[PDB]
Amino acid sequence: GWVPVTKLGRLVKAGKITTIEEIFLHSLPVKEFQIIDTLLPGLQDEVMNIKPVQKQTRAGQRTRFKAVVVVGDSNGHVGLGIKTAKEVAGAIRAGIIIAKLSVIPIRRGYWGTNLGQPHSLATKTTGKCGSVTVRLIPAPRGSGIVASPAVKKLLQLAGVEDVYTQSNGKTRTLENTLKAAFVAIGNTYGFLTPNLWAEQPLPVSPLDIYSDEASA
Amino acid sequence: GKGKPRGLNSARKLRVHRRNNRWAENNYKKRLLGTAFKSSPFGGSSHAKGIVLEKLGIESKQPNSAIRKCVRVQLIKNGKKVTAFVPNDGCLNFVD
Amino acid sequence: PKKRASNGRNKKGRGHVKPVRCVNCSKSIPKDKAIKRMAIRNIVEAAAVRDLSEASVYPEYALPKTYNKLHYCVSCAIHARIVRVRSREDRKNRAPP
Amino acid sequence: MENDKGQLVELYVPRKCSATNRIIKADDHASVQINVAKVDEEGRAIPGEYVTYALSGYVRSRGESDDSLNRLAQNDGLLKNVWSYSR
Amino acid sequence: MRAKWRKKRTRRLKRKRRKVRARSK
Amino acid sequence: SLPATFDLTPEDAQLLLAANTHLGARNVQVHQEPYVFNARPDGVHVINVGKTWEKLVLAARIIAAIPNPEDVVAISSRTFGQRAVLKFAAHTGATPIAGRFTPGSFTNYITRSFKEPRLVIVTDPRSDAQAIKEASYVNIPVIALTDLDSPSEFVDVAIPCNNRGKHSIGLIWYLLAREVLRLRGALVDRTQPWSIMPDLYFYRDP
Amino acid sequence: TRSSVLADALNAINNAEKTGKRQVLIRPSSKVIIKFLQVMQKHGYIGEFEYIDDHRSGKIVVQLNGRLNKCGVISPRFNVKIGDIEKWTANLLPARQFGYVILTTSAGIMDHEEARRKHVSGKILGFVY
Amino acid sequence: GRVRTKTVKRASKALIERYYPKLTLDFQTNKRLCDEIATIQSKRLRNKIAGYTTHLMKRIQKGPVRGISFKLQEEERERKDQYVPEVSALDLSRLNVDNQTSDLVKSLGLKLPLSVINVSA
Amino acid sequence: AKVHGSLARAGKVKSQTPKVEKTEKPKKPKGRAYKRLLYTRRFVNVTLVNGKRRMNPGPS
RNA sequence: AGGGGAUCGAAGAUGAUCAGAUACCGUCGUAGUCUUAACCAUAAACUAUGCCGACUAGGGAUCGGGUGGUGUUUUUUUAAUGACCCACUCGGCACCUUACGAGAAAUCAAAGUCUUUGGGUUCUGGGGGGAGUAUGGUCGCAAGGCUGAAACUUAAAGGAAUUG
Ligand SMILES: [Mg+2]
Ligand SMILES: [Mg+2]
Ligand SMILES: [Mg+2]
Ligand SMILES: [Mg+2]
Ligand SMILES: [Mg+2]
Ligand SMILES: [Mg+2]
Ligand SMILES: [Mg+2]
Ligand SMILES: [Mg+2]
Ligand SMILES: [Mg+2]
Ligand SMILES: [Mg+2]
Ligand SMILES: [Mg+2]
Ligand SMILES: [Mg+2]
């Protein structure tokens, strides 16, 4: 069982909030990972690499392994979680939890001639993460993911079909190349396009509409 | 202004500036100076023919301890002397 | 990198400060880089004046005071239990102890 | 946004900061949703009905969430001259 | 080593070369 | 707008003046404070008493809009606020936190003092900067009593007042609970003086 | 010294939009300023703007809104041909369904689309999106 | 060393919080309560429990000790909290106001008794 | 360094390796049939899927 | 090249120190330190931040000028002045806080307004060495300055932080 302790986990157990769409609309923090795997049961985990990092001690080195894990369903959502632990097996489970908790929405648009089922990104998006810049230029149809193999999977798992990529700095130390795209692929819902200028009535957050279910 | 001139009529500065800094490259240096023609015992070619003069007992760099069994060769077309390695297990016997 | 912002001294807008010499070893240290410690003292003591007190005409005369200005250097100051050393976070404090 | 024949796409039309008109990302935890009750001719609150205000994390980081609401509320009439346009 | 007295070794070196060179000239 | 009954009555204007609430800070000023008015010589500023009135009702309007009374939280760490915070929270849900704030009371769900407030109240932003901090981390609004030297950073609608004043802090807390109860329905009569004396919400040294 | 009033004007417009403001002061308000902003306000990016007439050169006060993303100048003003409009719009626009490349032609100041609707070309002034 | 440990600090603190109307400031009586009111695995701990109990019970005699709140202790704080004087200290004892507040109220348009006394540099 | 050394022991191990000859084995198919053969052992065969679908793990 | 040559003082003589000590330390000590006339063109000549122009956050202090204020003091209680006080301003040497911004971090109101990449302009760099060497010019009385390679060699020191 889950037996949640959180306002959102209580609703999600109660089934009062049905999709993550309401979570993202009012910017609700997510604390325990049961909220994710029950509202998005279609996420698949993919471990990118396991690299050891060592601390120097009085005598010898103790070893812990970094574990990058990328999650996401192939329609609209991606999560990147990086966690280190003593043993590789334990680090994989913990990095999965952070990856689900870090899930962000994605904006998919068109290169033009919006036939349907958007295939690319709506705008040029850039995410800088340290030295590296990762640029995501939307691509026309049939172009696919023109990207490095490690980045390619992160864009496959987010539902991007056609995209271009341009990099800078050291791409070949991947822990934050995958954080430069995550910023870029997450900055999709930050750019204000002319098709979003309209003003909305500010929907009331579910915590206030459904406050009658509070635990105490 | 980022350094370099941006004037619409400064192509002369940009082209000449690029010429002067192209010399810091190594391939552009060797190509235009023609060093491989003037040096590098071949004539810019990939192969050369010569006569074996003797065998050598060159010892290995760090970290490695071994004898490499090379040969001194004097080239035909220009007469220059080079040292060449004889790669395989025991192929120094065929190059006496 | 730069260990500190002023980074040796108070020279900001001068270039030259016409240096002085250390009181211990005579090192030609810059005057604004110096470690000036004004020394103020009584001419004799605050404890042995009792013995000198009964042996003086002009009762409670002045007990005059001795003044000095000492210019130490970095090597001399650090070596003799002076401003010697602090933590990286506490080097910003410009108030005297 | 929309495809060729209706069929609304681009889920999660996000909100806008009431002051800067920028949008609020999902990970913008420094943003605030403000519900202010409206009271009519009785002095007693009417639960469930609000005058809603949303502020982005940018203004709150800069310490003008208070100032923005002073002008925001006054324009709706639920304040008085506390905010003056001329400076 | 330090750059002052590798620079200084080279100047005593350059002094030596011009001295022996001028003998041929 | 307002029914003109929420307007500041003269029988409450002297209380604000009897508590020296209009007394501001020194010549030191924060530009984020447009509430200053008509400074005295020797470097004394004064807050327009008109402003702090509807700034006060606005805070109660937000408080009354929160459905559950206990989702309101008030934070006190300063000496002059421990008795005020608990007295205000005695007459409302408005669950109080006083003394040590044990940082991580908003995040870190496994902490003993985990709280998920719909809106918090802090007496002094500088002494309650930590309480203001996580409210900017887990999406929580903040109501603060602010003088002209206050750090309005990460603070929603604020009350211009004199946090230095001994009775100014208590009275503003008092008028806070008075106006919250009236809107909720506890005080049907607006003209009724709320017999509970404002001297209740004060600080005593012994 | 000052070389482009448009660069100084548009930089002031961006720095006010970066900081969240609704207004900015523009000095010294050349003719190509109004023409640049007149194009900008027709597309809704800026809106109301006001010309303060001092007897020296003029001033402009602009009322802003959060629609604008970036508004800059490409210097030098290259000659762009009717076939080279595509390269400019691909390099300096976020996408090809929105955004405008402002470029001066013999027929006044216009965007990259109005140039295509009129099939005229000229020199490039800047961009707003 | 004679500095008591956590297992002596915490067990003792748990007693006054719950046995305030109970075992007194005399050690030899306290230790004959602990041996039956609490299951302590070792005598040496029980002897140190009734030791730090007496030390804390001797503190509570003269004033209260901060960090200890037994529910009988704070009635002084849920009786002093309602302590209110009938004098109504917020009322008028005769209000003084500087010339700044003189025209401040006039700007606000309120009728208040203003015994104005000027305070200036 | 040194350019002299033991040149008398060149080819020490190659001339020292015991001579084991190639065993006679049936010919493998060439061209398309090899792709037919390789496809069978990899995709429609589950012979070596021990933990990771190894191709030529050592005998164990 | 003169004048000067009181101090200190590259060379050196001694006394130490030391296994050695032609070093550090102690005693002396010439060229110089000083100056006039003429050369030298270097410095970690450092803010290791080219110059010009624009905009973008708060705070106090100070220097020069100025503005206003029944403000204070001294003169002739009393004017003007001058010196202080308060508020503001223009220019300047700086400092304090924070990061929405930048950076590789250290840090930075400039090292910001840069993959959302264009204000103008000058100079310099392209792995570490060989090497600021060789060579040819050129300036200088000289010391050397300016300009300035190649052959050949080879995966091997830090700007920065972290743990020991
Ligand atoms: Mg690259
Ligand atoms: Mg030009
Ligand atoms: Mg200098
Ligand atoms: Mg130099
Ligand atoms: Mg330099
Ligand atoms: Mg500048
Ligand atoms: Mg100044
Ligand atoms: Mg100055
Ligand atoms: Mg290179
Ligand atoms: Mg090199
Ligand atoms: Mg190697
Ligand atoms: Mg280092």
Residue A29's nearest CA partner among D30, D87, H5, G64 is D30
Residues in chain H, how many?
121
Task: Answer whether the bond into residue F34 is a cis peptide, omega within 30°.
Answer: no
How far is it, in rounded angstroms, from Cα G103 to Cα G124?
A: 4
Residue A28's nearest CA partner among D59, F131, D14, F129 is D14
Residue of chain F with shortest Cα separation from D26: F139
Angle of helix H6-19 relative to helix H27-37, nearest 10 degrees?
Answer: 90
Strand J contacted by E11 CB (< 7 A) = yes
Scan for tokens 């807050």, then name that residue: F47
Which residues does chain D have within 8 Å of residue F136's beta carbon, measured at their own beta carbons? 29-30, 57, 60-61
Strands lying side by side in the sheet with B50-56:
B50-56, B70-75, B81-85
What are the structural domains, with CATH classification, of chain D?
1-87 (3.30.1230.20)
Which residues does chain B have within 8 Å of residue I4's beta carbon, measured at their own beta carbons? 57
Domains of chain F: total: 1
Annotate A89-151 with DSSP letters as a single string. Answer: HHHHHHHHHHHHHT-EE---B-SSS--SS--B-SS-EEEEETTEEEEEEE--TT--EES-HHH
Count of helices and strands (H, E) across chain B = 3, 3
What's the DSSP call for residue D59? Answer: H
Of 1.10.60.20, 3.40.50.300, 2.40.180.10, 1.10.3720.10, the CATH number of H6-61 is 1.10.60.20
Which helix (H) or strand (E) segment is H31 a member of?
helix H27-37
Q: Where are the alpha helices (DSSP H) in chain F?
A: 10-18, 49-65, 82-90, 129-135, 166-184
B50 in helix, strand or coil?
A: strand
Scan for tokens 């202790």, then name that residue: H73
How far is it, in rounded angstroms, from Cα A63 to Cα A159?
A: 36
Is A188 exposed, middle or buried, given 0-12, 13-18 or 19+ CB atoms closer than 10 A? buried
> CA C40 – C1' J72 distance (Å)?
35
By the CB < 8 Å criterion, does G20 face chain D? yes
Q: Where are the alpha helices (DSSP H) in chain D?
A: 57-62, 65-76
Find the radius of gyration of the CA atoms of chain I.
22
Domain ranges in chain B are 1-96
Token pair listed for H100? 């700044």
Experimental method: cryo-EM
Find the radius of gyration of the CA atoms of chain C.
19
Residues 27-46 on chain F lying near strand J, CB distance under 7 A: 27-31, 43
Q: How far is CA B83 from the centre of its chain?
A: 14
What residues are paired with G24 via a beta bridge? Answer: G62
Instruction: Please name the member of I10, I13, I14 whose beta carbon is closest to the beta carbon of B69.
Output: I10
Resolution (A): 2.5
Q: Does domain A7-105 have CATH number 3.30.160.20?
A: yes
CA distance F118 to chain H (A): 28
Q: Where are the alpha helices (DSSP H) in I1-60?
A: 32-42
* Cβ–Cβ under 8 Å, residues A190 and D20: no
How far is it, in rounded angstroms, from Cα D80 to Cα F51?
A: 8
Annotate G6-66 with DSSP letters as a single string. Answer: HHHHHHHHHHHHHHT-SEEEESS--HHHHHHHHHHHHTTSS--EEEE--SSS-EEEEE--T
How far is it, in rounded angstroms, from Cα A163 to Cα A135?
A: 10
Residue G31's nearest CA partner among G120, G118, G109, G114 is G109
Q: Does domain A108-196 have CATH number 3.40.50.720?
A: no
Bases of strand J lying below 7 A from some protein CB: 47-60, 71, 86-87, 93-97, 99-100, 102-108, 111-127, 131-135, 143-144, 150-152, 155, 159-164
Which helix (H) or strand (E) segment is H99 a member of?
helix H99-108
Strand J contacted by C88 CB (< 7 A) = yes
Which helix (H) or strand (E) segment is A52 a member of?
strand A46-56
How far is it, in rounded angstroms, from Cα A180 to Cα A186?
A: 10
Token pair listed for A58? 């009085």
Scan for tokens 């030791």, then name that residue: H51
Residue G128's nearest CA partner among G26, G13, G5 is G13
Strand J contacted by A168 CB (< 7 A) = yes
What's the sign of the alpha-carbon dihedral H21, H26, H28, H34? positive
Q: How far is CA H110 from CA F8, F11, F161, F192, H101, in A?
A: 9, 10, 20, 20, 11
Residues 53-82 on chain G lying near strand J, CB distance under 7 A: 69-70, 72-76
What's the sign of the alpha-carbon dihedral B11, B16, B17, B21? positive
Which residues does chain F have within 8 Å of residue D32's beta carbon, measured at their own beta carbons? 139-141, 156
Strands lying side by side in the sheet with G23-26:
G23-26, G59-63, G49-52
* Cβ–Cβ under 8 Å, residues A153 and A143: no
- The neighbours of chain H, by the rule of 3 or more Cβ pairs under 8 Å, are F
Residue H60's nearest CA partner among H8, H2, H15, H116 is H15
What's the DSSP call for residue D7? Answer: -
How far is it, in rounded angstroms, from Cα F5 to Cα A7?
A: 38
Angle of helix A178-186 relative to helix A149-156, nearest 10 degrees?
Answer: 30
H71 in helix, strand or coil?
A: coil
Question: At a CB cut-off of 8 Å and minimum separation 6, what does G49 contact?
Answer: G37, G41, G60, G61, G62, G63
Strand J contacted by B74 CB (< 7 A) = no
The amino acid at residue D21 is: N
Ligand 4 geometric centre to CA of C27 (Å): 26
Token pair listed for F135? 């409210």
- Cα angle A197, D69, D39 (rounded to 5 degrees) comes to 105
Residue C20's nearest CA partner among C67, C66, C69 is C69
> CA G127 – C1' J124 distance (Å)?
34
Ion ligand 2 residue ranges (Cβ < 5 Å): B 7-8; G 76
After which residues does chain G become discontinuous at a C–N distance over 2.5 Å? none
Strand J contacted by G23 CB (< 7 A) = no
* Cβ–Cβ under 8 Å, residues D8 and D50: no
Residue A139's nearest CA partner among A152, A130, A129 is A152
**Is the pair A, D in contact (3+ CB pairs within 8 Å)?**
yes
* Cβ–Cβ under 8 Å, residues F33 and F148: yes
* Cβ–Cβ under 8 Å, residues I3 and B56: yes
Which residues does chain H have within 8 Å of residue F37's beta carbon, measured at their own beta carbons? 100, 104
Residue G124's nearest CA partner among G52, G72, G65 is G72
Q: Is residue F87 part of a domain?
A: yes
How far is it, in rounded angstroms, from Cα C85 to Cα C31?
A: 20
Q: How far is CA B41 from the centre of its chain?
A: 9
- Domain ranges, residue F168: 12-206
The amino acid at residue C40 is: I
* Cβ–Cβ under 8 Å, residues G126 and G74: yes
Residue F138's nearest CA partner among A79, A28, A25 is A28
Ligand 6 geometric centre to CA of G1 (Å): 11
Question: 10 Å Cβ neighbour count for E11?
Answer: 9
SS3 content of chain D, % helix, strand, coil (to 5): 20, 15, 65
Domain ranges in chain A are 7-105, 108-196
The amino acid at residue G2 is: R
SS3 content of chain F, % helix, strand, coil (to 5): 35, 15, 50
What residues are paired with G50 via a beta bridge? Answer: G61
Strand J contacted by E7 CB (< 7 A) = yes
Ligand 5 geometric centre to CA of E8 (Å): 21
* Cβ–Cβ under 8 Å, residues G124 and G80: yes
Residue G22's nearest CA partner among F58, D72, F27, A129 is D72
Q: How far is CA D41 from CA A116, C62, H12, in A?
A: 52, 85, 60
Question: At a CB cut-off of 8 Å and minimum separation 6, what does A81 contact?
Answer: A68, A69, A70, A71, A95, A96, A97, A98, A99, A100, A101, A102
Q: Is residue F203 part of a domain?
A: yes
By the CB < 8 Å criterion, does F182 face chain D? yes
Residue D52's nearest CA partner among D37, D39, D31 is D37
* Cβ–Cβ under 8 Å, residues G128 and G9: no
Residue F145's nearest CA partner among F66, F61, F85, F196 is F85
* Cβ–Cβ under 8 Å, residues B19 and B12: no
b/e code D11-35 from CB counts within 10 Å (16+ = b): bbebbbbbbbbbbbbbbbbbbbbbb
Q: Is residue F7 part of a domain?
A: no
Strand J contacted by B83 CB (< 7 A) = no
